[model samples]
Target: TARTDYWLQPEIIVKIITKKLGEKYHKKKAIVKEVIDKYTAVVKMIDSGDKLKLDQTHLETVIPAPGKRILVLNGGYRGNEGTLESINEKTFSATIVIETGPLKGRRVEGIQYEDISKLA
Candidate 1:
C-alpha cells in the first residue's frame, strides 16, 4: 500500500515515469494542479499546458538545488518543511534543516531524495 501521509498534494512538482503516457510525458516535469484522491492527481505539464490524471506511482518527487525549500514526504520527518542544505550523490541522500514545526532549525542527515519534494 502507498503511504497515505506521503500522498502528493496540489502545487508540488513531479516527474512522470509511466512510459504508457507517451514520450512527451515520460520523465517530463509537471505540477500537481489538483488532487483527486490519496492515490491520484491531475497534473499540468511544465513545458506544455497539457494535463493528465495519474496515480502517485507514476510520479516521482522533484529535488531542487541545495538551499531550496522542500517538504519531507516520508520517514521520520514526514509532513515537515525544510531547507535542503546539501546532497550526497554517492549515497543518494541529502542533508536538510527543519524549517518549521517543533523541530525548527534542527539539522538532519542521510535523508533520501525520494523522501522529500521541492515545494512550489
Candidate 2:
C-alpha cells in the first residue's frame, strides 16, 4: 500500500503552500509545532512566528545543507535522524549518514526531497 503518512513530527522545518487559504502562505517557511494526525498539524511561521493549522498536502520538507541534521519523513528510513552528506538535484535525491538508531554510521542514498526534513 502507498504510504499516506509522511511521518511528520514537531520541530521540523517545512515550506507551506496552501493557495486555497491564501497566497501569502505560498513558499513560506514554518516550523511544525504539533501534529494532530498523519495529515494535519499546527505550525509556526519562521519569520513572523504566526501559528496556523494546515494539512500535510500543503507542507513540504526543507532540505538542509550538507553536514546538517535531517529527519527522514518516509521511505524505509522513516523516523530516522541523520546527517545530510550530499544532494543531487538532477535525481531529486539526497545522500545521508544515519546518526541515530541501529543504522547509525550507515550511509544511505536516493532519499527523496519530500521524504526528509531539516530537523530544528
Candidate 3:
C-alpha cells in the first residue's frame, strides 16, 4: 500500500479480503478488533467469530456499532424489546435478540432501524 494514512480504525466495522467467502471482501463486514500497528490488525467476523490478521489495504471501515436497548415497532414481532444485534444493510433491517417480554431468547430478523428506537 502506498498511502501512509489509515482508512481503517480499531473497533470500527471493516471489510476483509480473503478467498474463503463467496461474497467479495468489500461486501463482508467484519469487526476490527486490535490494531497490531499502523498497517496490521486483528478483525473478528461478526457471524462466525473467526478472527483474521489483515493489512489495512485489504480493509475499509464501514458502519458504526449500534447502541443498546432498541425498541421494535411495526412488525409481526412488534412490541418486542431488545438491543442491536446485527444490521443487514442489504435488507435495510436489523437482527435483534429479544431481551424482555414473551419473545425472550428469540431472534427477530429484518426489523428496520427506523422501526426501532433506542431507549435513550
Candidate 4:
C-alpha cells in the first residue's frame, strides 16, 4: 500500500479494512452481562453509568486470540460520539468498526450497551 502516511494509524486501518472486507476476523458475537441503568435511555452515552453499559471482557468463555471484535464496554474507548458528548473509559464509548471481518456492522446491543454478561 502506497501513501502509507495518508493511511490511518495502522491499528485503525486494520480495523477499518476488516470492516470493509467481512473476513470473519472479528466475530460479532457478544453477550449481555451487565446493564447500566438510567432514568431513561439516552443516545450519546456519557459513561458506563450515564446510560447503561457492559464489561470490557468476556468472563464466561475463553476469548480467542486476535478475536474479531474489540468488545464494546459501557463507556468510550478511543473516541467520543457525535462530538459534544463527554467520553470516559466507562462512557461515550466505541468499538472497532471492522471493515472486512466476520461480524461486520453487527452491533450487539442489550437494548442498551449495559445488559451484557459473559457469565449469564
**Whole-model lDDT values for every prediction:** 0.86, 0.87, 0.63, 0.23
Which candidate tops TM-score? Answer: 2
Better of 2 and 3 by TM-score: 2
Candidate 1 collision pairs: none
Ranking by lDDT: 2, 1, 3, 4
The digit string of per-residue lDDT tens for model 2 on 1-120 reads 334455678989999978766777789999999998677879998988888999888888899999999998778787789999999999989999999899899999888888889998
Model 4: residues with Cα > 4 Å off, grouped in runs: 1-30, 38-62, 72-120
Pick the lDDT winner.
2
Task: Please give the range of 10 consecutive residues that has the lowest summed lDDT in model 2.
Answer: 1-10
Better of 1 and 2 by TM-score: 2
Root mean square deviation (Cα) for candidate 2: 1.8
Tens digits of per-residue lDDT for model 1, 1-120: 334454677777899999877888999999888988577879999999798999988999888888999988778788889999999989988999999899999999999888888887
Write model 4 residue lDDT over 1-116, tens digit each, in one string.
22111111111111111222233323233233233342211111212212222222211221222233233222322221111111123552322332233544443322122311
Candidate 1 stretches with Cα past 4 Å from truth are 1-6
Candidates 3 and 4 compared by TM-score, better number = 3
| Backbone N/Cα/C clashes per model | 0, 0, 0, 36
TM-score of each: 0.88, 0.90, 0.42, 0.17
What TM value does model 4 have?
0.17
